[PDB]
Design goal:
Blueprint lengths: L1 E4 L14 H11 L6 E6 L6 E7 L2 E5 L6 H15 L7
Parallel strand pairs: 1-4
Antiparallel strand pairs: 2-3, 3-4
Helix pairs in contact: 1-2
The structure holds a RNA duplex (11 and 11 nucleotides).
PDB class: rna binding protein
Keywords: double-stranded RNA-binding domain protein-RNA complex dsRNA, RNA binding protein
Assembly: trimeric
Length: 90
RNA sequence: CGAACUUCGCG
RNA sequence: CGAACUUCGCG
């Protein structure tokens, strides 16, 4: 049901002002698809986060956990872009 | 985490 | 929408 990859967003790997979430939003626009929908969840252990992104009725999620909601969403966008072999920026 | 606040970038 | 920046409140 969900496509997963072991990915973590590291801002240092991307030029300033460029993000996987932005790239995905732009790709959906060009492909005339909806708009990504993110469902984010919290861990009571280390106060860790994960996110499931829905694009073209398919769900994507990293196998890894992140320090914040925003970082988890970026990881989910990476899974979506990368699993499709899409640019994702840098 | 959320909200407010300026700056920046794409629609 | 998204990024950086401070502030507030709660957590």
């Amino acid at each position: 049901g969900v496509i997963k990859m072991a990915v973590k967003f590291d801002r240092r790997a991307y030029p300033a002002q460029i993000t996987p979430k932005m790239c995905l939003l732009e790709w959906c626009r060009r492909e005339k698809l909806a708009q990504p929908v993110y469902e984010t969840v919290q861990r009571p252990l280390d106060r860790l986060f994960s996110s499931i992104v829905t694009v073209a009725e398919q769900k994507y999620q990293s196998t890894l956990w992140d320090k914040s909601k925003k970082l988890a969403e970026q990881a989910a966008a990476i899974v979506c872009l990368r699993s499709q072999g899409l640019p994702e920026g840098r």
